[PDB]
Symmetry: none
Subunit: 56 residues, 5 copies
């Protein structure tokens, strides 16, 4: 399945996605990716819509 990460940071904003079997494994990319992207804030995950969002 695929999950979608929304970029909501100081200036980082747009969308992000990944293909994974598990939600927690998908976050590994997005959370680690957030460091490479700069926006690191409070995280959340909706398993009902496979959608993640990070807000700082």
């Amino acid at each position: 399945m695929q999950y979608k990460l929304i970029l909501n940071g100081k200036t980082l904003k747009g969308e992000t996605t990944t293909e994974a079997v598990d939600a927690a494994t998908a976050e590994k990319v997005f959370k680690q990716y957030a460091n490479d992207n700069g926006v690191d804030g409070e995280w959340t995950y909706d398993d009902a819509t496979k959608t993640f969002t990070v807000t700082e």
Copy 2:
């Protein structure tokens, strides 16, 4: 300054960079370049680290 665009598309993946005064002028190259590259998706812009990323 320099901004970095990450390639995250169907199969287009690697890194990209450009030297510009403005972030919006830097995107003109990357967003226009994306058409020439094939990967056209949602966009975010890190002004916090000068990093862009496109996801389709």
Copy 3:
């Protein structure tokens, strides 16, 4: 990035803009918008200044 459409028709004159990754996707709004606006003429697009113009 942003493109600018100039209105040059029979009586419809002004400026128009849109935020898009591609120039061609930006035209979809402007060209389709022109029908809703009434001014439909010869089109052109400058990718060097992200500027469109329709003349009838």
Copy 4:
């Protein structure tokens, strides 16, 4: 150390400064700041006097 940016634009003129370790990091503020200020032109950087100047 500190770098100094000179404002030489259409109507925006004055002086600017910032405290940074690197020259390229100092420009991030000045070049990004220029968008917020309106004056965006050709850039230059003297590392011998830590002085930047933007001319449009």
Copy 5:
């Protein structure tokens, strides 16, 4: 099929191509070739158009 590598380095610029069944096998030549050419940077691989590009 054939893939195309674009040269975008410090001073090395041009086009490159190779005939291969797989993309990863095609890169072996281009990546290894880049060492012989001097331009070694970040890499992307467009499989969507069969086009590679290296930026340093």
